[PDB]
């Protein structure tokens, strides 16, 4: 499993949640302010 432990830190996030990675992918896009639309 990859819900904690075994994560394999990829030099850019450890825990690496897959649902939180879509929320982190989400916010990754929305880390500008007005450059999404």
From Swiss-Prot:
It is found in: Secreted. It comes from the Bacteria. Disulfide bonds join 9-14. GO terms for biological process: defense response to bacterium; killing of cells of another organism. Keywords: Antibiotic, Antimicrobial, Bacteriocin, Disulfide bond, Plasmid, Secreted. Belongs to the bacteriocin class IIA/YGNGV family. This is Bacteriocin leucocin-A.
């Amino acid at each position: 499993k990859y819900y904690g432990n075994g994560v394999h830190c990829t030099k850019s996030g450890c825990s690496v949640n897959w649902g939180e990675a879509f929320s982190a992918g989400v916010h990754r896009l929305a880390n500008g302010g007005n450059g999404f639309w």
